[PDB]
Write a protein that binds this ligand. Structure first.
Ligand SMILES: Nc1ncnc2c1ncn2[C@@H]1O[C@H](COP(=O)(O)OP(=O)(O)OP(=O)(O)O)[C@@H](O)[C@H]1O
Lengths: 184, 196, 50, 50, 57, 128, 438, 31, 23, 138
């Protein structure tokens, strides 16, 4: 016969409201954090909303549900691409589980700092508050990438000549405590 | 508290005259300045060695008569006021001295920018390359920039208003004790630091 | 092009064809903004804590 | 006077009767005092020795 | 319609008034009598207003 | 009468000569004790060194770091009702107390009072 | 009866620009009118409350005697330390500013003796007259107006002269007094009129007045329900009430703003702020420019001269050695290095002299709402530092006078005002340790 | 109202001869 | 409800889902 | 406004391209805002996980069921219940011996059928079993 499942277990929310009651409608606007500009969801965004990631034929019932079955109910066989897709789903799940386990072991070992972001992010973004009180070619490559992407701009030498080891200190005389100055 | 091997390269110094910079200080401050910088200061006369009677009181430079005949008793409230006036003068000097570089994208060899610069971005670059924390409300664009911003590619500038100057008495030395001129230079950078 | 019958007046010999009037809507119907007017609010008797 | 020099070096310059630095001395003295490997390149007779 | 709403005129129901064959805004006699009955005692009402109400009637 | 906003009094911190910093240090023991005995809950967060709080333990207190308080990692533990909730910052250093109060104000808690360990002892909140 | 117009006719002679005692006397007299005079002794004007009943018409009107609060002290005081009752019902009418109306209007039960019912109303125009053509006509009329008050803050739509405007109650709420002076203590408009720039009038009156009037007006409602009804609440002002509102707005515009300027100048004076051939050529002021010299070379360069210095740049007129340049700098008192000029400012190292705190002016500003932000910004840190130092001295065991302590204690214990908790606690602790009460 | 307010600026007589009479009639009949 | 959450406290980290939007 | 009238003629991109660039800028700002969050968050056992959340409203989103689960109260109230539930958690493919606390006659599947043998799984489009059990051993 015919099969229609949007979930692994087949369960779902009540598709229809109670008789005589106002229904619930999804958010028509694109999920943009700023209140403006307001834009209606595109068809691709509606597909993402309904669960088909991006285009049709991907991560949805149109791909998960069996393509056919025998008239006596006998199911089809396992295709190589079907096994590959099962392995891909397992790979996503393994990525999630391993990332979560890494976070848990970092928190257990105490490697998660109390200050949000990295030092480069703190030196760049002013919206963050101030918190006071084998082979080696690949290693050299990582070091030079860090040296090139750490400080995108330098303090002008007219203020503090970095060749003499002179650095400027944070002058927070005109700062503000409320984040609205950067949010608005 | 500084390690001895580092402190060997410094020396205690009482500032007689207010000096702006990362190795400067306000008049009447005990500061560990580097050897060469402290030598320059003591040769120019803008600093002395911190004796006990000098730490109690010290003669400072009087700009009205251009002599060092202004005696000052180093008090808690005086040190607080002088530190605050030094912070004001220091941020003014930082903002008024050099340029502010903005690497942005511009399609082709056009004259304008893709996304115009706003006060948030101006304050971001101020904190980034000047280490100055301000709120974007103090920034004022020019008349031609009130509508869109710093969209023009090249040499630009805006106004940065510093409110608290009359309480500190910074009306004489500064050319304009109400606002600063922030020289801005926007460059078409298609490199990794474009982000826009 | 031959399926176009151009007449500078309203007189045309195509009466036996019974040409139906063609109605098309111009896509430009934008008002570019519309703010709602302010009206006097109408109150209910039970609304005042009843 | 803009570059840091000990008083003994000040007296050595006065003994050698040298007051204004040459363009090579205006550039190379600071880099060497920063303890960096420097290539002092200058033409003949411009104070490259000092 | 844009020029109409820009000049600021309103589309009243036919019972009130309408633009006649000469595109002149003719006011219904009933509408004129009701306008009179409402604005009898206003400050701007005048002998000419009464005369025009009789003219419309 | 028209209500003067609480933010209208924040113009005092903009004074470049008499600014706050570039302080709840005084409390009546009896008044603080009766306030705590009327509240009867967990309203005290102690922000100080671990060795310090092991030397001077304070039960019925939340041991948090001021960096966590500022970053906002303790918001679901915070009372979630920022209007009627009043918090007591226990810090041996007045600078740490001011920093924790500023963090709580930034996250939306204005009713934050700084208390000392000796004040808490003489008020009787900490048992012995 | 004593009115603000009488107070101004009395102040007509006080020289405020030349003396500070006269400004203090003016503020003291205004504080006397605000706190020492009775609300029943203050003049009132009649108005009516119309209630239209739509069955889907019947109209019932209530006689109201309204006190107008247009001045800042009246607006911030309200029904504080006063009673409505010692066929007409008393009330108070607040006229807010569009700046404060764009923001969320919030009222609070500040030292009220009776539970009050407040109504946020707005001047609404009929839809036919609400078109942008009539709006432009009203704007042109207001721009060409010759009236005394400022049209930007007071009646920016001409609701006093508009023949078709009606003041409709867009929202309602209530305020219950504090348990100490006599359960919602705050009130903001909701629903229609939320963040509306047109809701600029508040009406405070007896509690449950709207509900009682609606109940008394709804008599046929029972039969119409037994065999859904809507209510429209509007407020109509008498001609004398409108004239008093206009006069208070004009008095504000022409008296309070110069008074606020004088208070700001006085606060600045009390804080210490008073208005005002050699080879090296020093910076000189730029010569006066003629017509063609001031005219730029191109019409596009008109904005280039926006930010320009009024003084020229220092210069050296020849080629010299380093000792000669240093000697010339020392003899001319002018440095050549721009870096040195920027890093070595000519500033006074001593702190500017500042007279002591004026607790009288501070209390007057906080209690009259005149230049309250300036008073806070200029004196709050000073007062906090002085009281903290005095408290440290008292705890370790003066400069703080008992009169100032009493004034600050009264200002803190004043229920009609809200002071920060840190200031309140500091003042209370200093008083408790210095044995000063009331 | 707009017509009257724009005409009264350059009107002949500055007194309220007829407008006060109209206002009196309104105040006596309307309410 | 106006008090601080009682009982023991558990630390909860985060994970990122990163999607490449450009070449 | 001559400078503005001249600048209006200078534009490298059309209006739609400028709107897309500004959307890209907003996306970058969203990434920065998400990165400005702390690394962890102190929670409690009893309260729901969606209590201290820092946050186009009124409509249903794609994470509706997830938000409902986050809003409902937690099902493990105390660490005592946590450990009383976790101690009964059993691992099958774990390396090492396992106890026989409850029953003795009950033998394991590996104890009955060795380690190289698997049950014949129904292989169909819906049931995809782990083929080649020997490839899983590192
Ligand atoms: N600042 C100065 N002012 C005046 N004279 C100088 C200065 N510096 C160096 N001289 C003089 O220049 C002369 C040449 O100096 P030096 O030996 O450095 O030249 P050089 O570049 O090394 O030449 P070569 O490459 O031929 O050896 C010295 O005798 C010295 O007296």
């Amino acid at each position: 016969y015919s099969e229609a499942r949007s979930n692994y277990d087949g369960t779902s929310l009540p598709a229809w409201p109670a008789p005589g009651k106002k229904p619930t409608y999804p958010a028509a606007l694109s999920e943009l954090r700023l209140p403006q500009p307001r834009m209606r969801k595109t068809r691709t965004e509606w597909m993402y909303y309904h669960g088909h990631g991006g285009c049709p034929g991907k991560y949805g019932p149109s791909r998960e549900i069996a393509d056919f079955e025998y008239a006596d109910g006998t199911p089809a066989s396992i295709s190589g691409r079907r096994f590959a897709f099962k392995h891909h789903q397992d790979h996503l799940l393994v990525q999630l589980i391993r990332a979560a386990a890494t976070v848990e072991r970092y928190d257990a070992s105490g490697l998660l700092p109390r200050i949000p972001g990295t030092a480069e992010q703190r030196n760049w973004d002013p919206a963050i508050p101030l918190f006071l009180d084998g082979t080696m070619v690949s290693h050299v490559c990582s070091r030079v990438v860090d040296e090139r992407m750490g400080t995108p701009t330098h303090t002008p030498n007219e203020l503090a000549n970095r060749h003499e080891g002179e650095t400027l200190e944070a002058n927070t005389m005109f700062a503000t405590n409320d984040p609205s100055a950067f949010v608005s | 508290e500084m390690a001895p091997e580092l402190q060997l390269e410094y020396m205690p110094v009482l500032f007689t005259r207010t000096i702006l910079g990362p190795q400067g200080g306000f008049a009447g401050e005990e500061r560990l300045v580097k050897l060469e910088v402290a030598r320059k200061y003591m040769e120019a006369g803008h600093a002395v060695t911190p004796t006990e009677e000098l730490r109690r009181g010290l003669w400072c430079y009087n700009p009205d008569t251009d002599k060092y005949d202004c005696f000052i008793e180093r008090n808690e409230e005086f040190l607080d006021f002088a530190a605050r006036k030094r912070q004001w003068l220091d941020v003014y000097w930082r903002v008024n001295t050099g340029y502010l570089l903005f690497g942005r994208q511009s399609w082709g060899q056009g004259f304008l920018i893709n996304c115009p610069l706003r006060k948030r971005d101006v304050a971001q670059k101020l904190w980034e390359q000047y280490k100055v924390r301000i709120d974007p409300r103090l920034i004022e664009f020019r008349e031609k920039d009130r509508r869109t911003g710093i969209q023009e590619l090249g040499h630009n500038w805006c106004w940065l208003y510093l409110p608290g100057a009359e309480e500190l008495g910074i009306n004489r030395e500064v050319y304009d004790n109400k606002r600063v001129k922030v020289r801005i230079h926007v460059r078409k950078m298609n490199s990794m630091f474009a982000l826009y | 092009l031959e399926k176009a019958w151009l007449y500078e007046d309203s007189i045309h010999p195509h009466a036996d064809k019974n040409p139906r009037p063609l109605c098309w809507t111009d896509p430009e119907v934008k008002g570019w903004k519309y703010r709602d007017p302010q009206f006097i609010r109408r109150w209910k008797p039970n609304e005042f804590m009843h | 006077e803009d570059m840091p020099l000990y008083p003994e070096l000040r007296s050595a310059l006065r003994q050698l009767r040298i007051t204004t630095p040459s363009p090579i001395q205006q550039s190379a003295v600071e880099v060497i005092m920063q303890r960096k490997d420097t290539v002092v390149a200058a033409p003949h007779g411009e104070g490259k020795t000092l | 319609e844009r020029q109409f709403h820009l000049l600021g005129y309103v589309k009243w129901p036919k019972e009130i008034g309408f633009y006649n064959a000469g595109d002149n805004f003719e006011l219904t006699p009933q509408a004129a009598y009701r306008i009179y009955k409402q604005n009898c005692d206003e400050t701007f009402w005048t002998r000419l207003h009464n005369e025009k109400t009789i003219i419309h009637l | 009468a028209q209500w003067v906003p609480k933010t209208a009094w924040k113009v005092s911190n903009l004074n470049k000569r008499y600014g706050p910093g570039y302080t709840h240090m005084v409390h009546d023991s009896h008044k603080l004790r009766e306030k705590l005995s009327s509240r009867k809950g967990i309203f005290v967060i102690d922000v100080r060194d671990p060795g310090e709080r092991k030397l001077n333990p304070v039960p019925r207190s939340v041991a948090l770091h001021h960096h966590d308080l500022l970053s906002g990692a303790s918001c679901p533990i915070l009372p979630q009702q920022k209007s009627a909730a009043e918090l007591f910052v226990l810090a041996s250093n007045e600078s740490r107390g001011l920093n924790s109060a500023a963090a709580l104000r930034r996250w939306g808690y204005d009713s934050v009072v700084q208390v000392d360990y000796n004040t808490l002892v003489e008020a009787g909140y900490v048992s012995r | 009866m004593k009115s603000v117009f009488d107070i101004a006719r009395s102040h007509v002679t006080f020289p405020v620009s030349r003396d500070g005692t006269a400004l203090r006397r003016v503020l003291k007299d205004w504080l006397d009118y605000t706190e020492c005079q009775s609300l029943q002794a203050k003049p009132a004007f009649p108005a009516e409350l119309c209630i239209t009943v739509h069955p889907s018409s019947y109209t019932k009107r209530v006689r109201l005697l309204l006190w107008s609060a247009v001045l800042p002290w009246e607006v911030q005081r309200g029904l504080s330390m006063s009673v409505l009752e010692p066929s007409i019902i008393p009330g108070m009418l607040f006229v807010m500013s569009p700046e404060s109306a764009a923001q969320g209007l919030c009222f609070w039960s500040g030292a009220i003796r009776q539970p009050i019912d407040i109504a946020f109303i707005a001047p609404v125009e009929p839809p036919a007259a609400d078109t942008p053509s009539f709006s432009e006509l009203r704007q042109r009329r207001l721009q060409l107006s010759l009236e005394g008050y400022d049209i930007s803050r007071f009646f920016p739509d001409g609701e006093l002269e508009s023949p078709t405007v009606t003041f409709a109650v867009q929202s309602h709420s209530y305020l219950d007094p504090f348990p100490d002076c006599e359960r919602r203590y705050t009130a903001t408009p909701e629903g229609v009129g939320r963040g509306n720039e047109n809701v600029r009038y508040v009406l405070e009156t007896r509690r449950n007045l709207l509900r009682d009037s609606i109940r008394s007006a709804l008599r046929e409602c029972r039969c119409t329900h037994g065999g859904d009804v809507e209510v429209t609440i509007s407020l109509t002002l008498s001609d004398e009430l409108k004239e008093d509102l206009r006069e208070k707005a004009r008095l504000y515009t022409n008296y309070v703003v110069p008074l606020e300027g004088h208070v700001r100048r006085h606060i600045k004076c009390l804080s210490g702020i008073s208005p005002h051939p050699p080879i090296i050529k020093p910076p000189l002021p730029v010569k006066v420019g003629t017509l063609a010299s001031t005219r730029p070379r191109s019409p596009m360069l008109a904005d280039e001269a926006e930010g320009r210095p009024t003084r020229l740049a220092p210069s050296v007129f020849g080629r010299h050695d380093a000792p000669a340049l240093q000697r010339a700098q020392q003899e001319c008192n002018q440095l050549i290095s721009a870096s040195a000029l920027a890093r070595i400012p000519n500033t006074s190292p001593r702190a500017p002299e500042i007279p002591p705190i004026d607790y009288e002016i501070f209390d007057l500003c906080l209690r009259l709402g005149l230049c309250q932000s300036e008073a806070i910004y200029y004196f709050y840190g000073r007062i906090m530092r002085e009281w903290s130092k005095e408290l440290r001295r008292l705890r370790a065991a003066m400069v703080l006078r008992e009169e100032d302590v009493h004034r600050m204690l009264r200002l803190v214990h004043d229920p009609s005002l809200q002071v920060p908790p840190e200031l309140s606690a500091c003042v209370e602790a200093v008083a408790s340790l210095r044995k000063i009460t009331n | 109202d707009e017509i009257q307010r724009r005409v009264a600026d350059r009107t002949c007589v500055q007194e309220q001869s007829t407008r006060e009479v109209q206002e009196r009639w309104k105040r006596h009949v309307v309410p | 409800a106006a008090a601080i959450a009682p009982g023991p406290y558990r630390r909860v980290g985060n994970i990122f889902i990163v999607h490449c939007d450009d070449h | 406004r001559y400078r503005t009238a001249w600048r209006e003629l200078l534009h490298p991109l059309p209006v739609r391209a400028r709107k897309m660039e500004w959307l890209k800028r907003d996306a970058v700002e969203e990434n920065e805002e998400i990165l400005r969050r702390p690394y962890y968050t102190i929670k409690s056992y009893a309260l729901p996980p969606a209590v201290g959340r820092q946050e186009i409203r009124g409509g249903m989103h794609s994470s509706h069921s997830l938000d409902l689960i986050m809003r409902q109260p937690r099902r493990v109230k105390t660490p005592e219940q946590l450990r009383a539930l976790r101690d009964r958690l059993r691992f099958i493919g774990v390396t090492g011996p396992m106890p026989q606390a409850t029953s003795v006659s009950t033998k394991s599947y590996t104890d009955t059928y060795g380690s190289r043998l698997r049950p014949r799984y129904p292989e169909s489009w819906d049931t995809v079993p782990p083929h080649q059990p020997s490839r899983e051993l590192l």
